Structures are given as C-alpha cells and as structure tokens.
Amino acid sequence: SPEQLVLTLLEAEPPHVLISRPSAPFTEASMMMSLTKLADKELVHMISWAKKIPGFVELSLFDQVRLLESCWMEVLMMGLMWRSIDHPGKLIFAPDLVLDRDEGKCVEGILEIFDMLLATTSRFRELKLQHKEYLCVKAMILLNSSMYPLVTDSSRKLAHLLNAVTDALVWVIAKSGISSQQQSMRLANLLMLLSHVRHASNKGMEHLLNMKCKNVVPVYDLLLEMLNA
C-alpha cells in the first residue's frame, strides 16, 4: 500500500560508499580501478537493498538472481544520477570522488557514457525529480526487467510488486496537486527516462566487459561474478 511502501523504500536506501581519488594523477588504469572498486562495493550493498523491498525475498531464488543480474548497472547509474542531480557538469560517485565531465577523457569510451549519464541527470533536474519519486523509480528499475520464462507463481508475485510500486509512484505524483493531464505527462516523462537508463546501462556494461578483456583493469569478487554474466 502506497504510503507504507514508500516508507519501506526510504528505509531501504543503501549506505553511501566512501572512496577517494588516488594520490597520483589519474591514468586510464587507475580511473577504472577507482570506478570498479566503487561499483563492486555498491553492488554488495545493492543486494541488501533489494532484499528489503517487500516481497523481493518471497520471489524464487532464480527470479531474485535474474532481476539483479539484469538491472545492477541501471541501479548503480540511477543512484549516481540522483547523487549528481544538483551538480551540473559533475558526477558525484562519492563525497570524495566527484568527477568533472572532462575527466572521462581519461578513459577511452567513457566520456560518451558520462555524457549520457549527465544528460539523463539534467532531464531529471529539469523535471525536478523528488526524493520519493526517485525511490519508486529505482525500485521500478529493479522490478521491470524482461523475464521471458526460464526453465528452472513467482512471476505473478513479480507483477503484483511492480504494480504496487507503480501505484506508489502515481500516488506520490498525486501529491503535487497538478492537473490530471499534467500528472499523466509527468508519469510519462519519468517512465520514458527508463529507456535512457537502460541504454546508458548497456553502454556501461559493454565498456566494462571490454575493459576486462583488454586487462585494462583487474576486476574482483561480486563485480567480476556479475560480469562473467
């Protein structure tokens, strides 16, 4: 139910992961080390986050695993955009890791991704995304991935959840008091941005799968596991 669902998502928010710039000037290698070390740690905390969304741990193990494998980069990115919303031209990876757009020139292929993330962030800024709409949208990203049957009631349980989260978002938007028609347009504007997040996600994934090839960066643990696919 919408108020309680929203409070749960609020209380589910993962901690801020702290990381610092290296002492030496960035290289392609050291910038990627910093971003993947951060991503790996935020991944750890993402699992605990997903587990606190009501109903998530009631889905089957395969379903839990499969939504997380499908959405993790989107969720990393969405949390990054939220952190950065108030800071045009910057990506707020952590309090002490704030990259200027031009810093992406440091790593082949990463400027484009920064630009996509920065543009999606400006669109959220222009829409004046509220905290509670961000909570619902981030949870929607977790729950809204293709599933096509796997061969292994979980799927109806998934639909009910996503339903409830989409209801919660509609409910949040109703608070603004705007016209019925403007409430529909804001919902549409928000959800249409889900494609941009998936699209940046795809470029991020491909970037990291390729880096891992080039041994431009060693990757570890949870992050390496998620990438191994």
């Binding site: 741990v57 193990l61 494998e69």
Partner: peptide, 10 residues
C-alpha cells in the same frame, strides 16, 4: 556461476 550472489541472497 552466481556462486557469490546466491551466497549474499540466502
């Protein structure tokens, strides 16, 4: 394969 994820979920 999800040797670690399975671990953190369960």
């Amino acid at each position: 394969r999800h040797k670690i994820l399975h671990r953190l979920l369960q």
